[PDB]
């Protein structure tokens, strides 16, 4: 039928998930907008109902968004979440693939109190990347704040009751995205709190340089291609990603990368940090974003745009 999950009417297909496609679509009893993902049923590598766990226990944390609907639809399952908006990787293609310091600053420390979160529920979250962190939608309250989907990698990294961190271990396949992940990972080290929040270094030092020195290499086979990556990064010190830049951004990047494997990372510290390159720069933080200024000061716009 053109309804799932008793309640989900299903619109124009929005995106393209890690194995079936997303649509947007309208809970029929409220008109409440969600996004609908397919996953084949038998599928090789099931995630989509892992994911829907990750949800329900993530359900009222700022930023992530409620999972209404999680059920068997024919030949797929399907999971149905809030409806967002685009992703900051989106929105830095279209402000010309560079933010202003300030609208850095501001969308990383949203990001370091997204992924402290995670952190708090026992995950880690392993994908980090500017695609799938997404503002709200047009109009919303929450409609440019910075919100986190796509749970599909995430793990538990301690016990939850009694809290004993899983144990270091190497050998790991070089699952994650090669732009953005923690030199650890590129080592076939087992990630923990700090690789998530070394991406995010990644993340904003890309944001504000336009690029990162590892983009644009070649090799072969993409496991050479990895270890380019992670070899750049290895001899590439943080003062030289941060030349022109906030120092704070350099001394993120070197503290996280310098936490023991199991250690709890000072998240409000690290927000505090890079808080106070506003303060050196005369800036004040009031939400402004850049793509809040395109198209004439609309923001967005499906035709210009997307
Ligand atoms: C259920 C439904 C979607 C998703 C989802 N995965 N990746 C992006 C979205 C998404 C989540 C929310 N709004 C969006 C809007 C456009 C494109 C993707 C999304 N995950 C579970
Ligand atoms: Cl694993
Ligand atoms: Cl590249």
């Known amino acids: 039928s053109s309804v799932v999950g008793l309640h ?10 890690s194995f079936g496609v997303i649509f947007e679509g309208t809970n029929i009893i409220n008109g409440v907008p969600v996004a609908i993902k397919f996953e084949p049923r038998k ?34 399952n399907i999971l149905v979440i809030d409806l967002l908006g685009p992703s900051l990787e989106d929105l830095f293609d279209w402000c010309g693939r560079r933010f202003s310091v300030k609208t850095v600053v501001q969308v990383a420390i949203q990001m370091l109190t997204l992924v402290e979160e995670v952190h708090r529920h026992d995950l880690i979250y392993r994908d980090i990347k500017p695609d799938n962190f997404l503002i709200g939608r ?8 910075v919100h986190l989907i796509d749970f599909g990698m995430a793990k538990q990294y301690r016990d939850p009751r009694t809290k004993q961190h899983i144990p270091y271990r190497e050998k790991k396949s070089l699952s994650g995205t090669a732009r953005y992940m923690s030199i650890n990972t590129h ?9 998530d929040l070394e991406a995010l270094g990644h993340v904003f030092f890309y944001f ?11 090799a072969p086979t993409n496991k050479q291609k990895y270890e380019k990556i992670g070899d750049k990064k290895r001899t590439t010190p943080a003062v030289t990603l941060c030349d022109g830049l906030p120092q704070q951004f350099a001394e993120y990047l070197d503290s996280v990368r310098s936490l023991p494997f199991d ?23 009031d939400g402004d974003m850049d793509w809040m200024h395109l198209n004439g000061g609309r923001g967005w716009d499906a035709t210009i745009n997307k």
């Open 8 to 17: 989900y009417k299903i619109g124009k297909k929005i995106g393209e998930g």
């Open 43 to 76: 599928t090789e590598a099931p995630q989509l109902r892992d994911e829907y766990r990750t949800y329900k226990h993530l359900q009222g944390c700022d930023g992530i968004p409620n999972a209404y609907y999680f059920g068997q639809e024919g030949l797929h």
């Open 138 to 145: 047009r109009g919303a309250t929450d409609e440019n704040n």
């Open 187 to 195: 080592l076939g080290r087992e990630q923990s709190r700090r690789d």
């Open 208 to 218: 504000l340089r336009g690029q990162l020195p590892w983009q644009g290499l070649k």
């Open 263 to 285: 250690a709890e990372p000072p998240y409000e510290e690290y927000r505090m940090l890079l808080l106070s390159v506003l303060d050196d720069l005369g800036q004040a933080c």
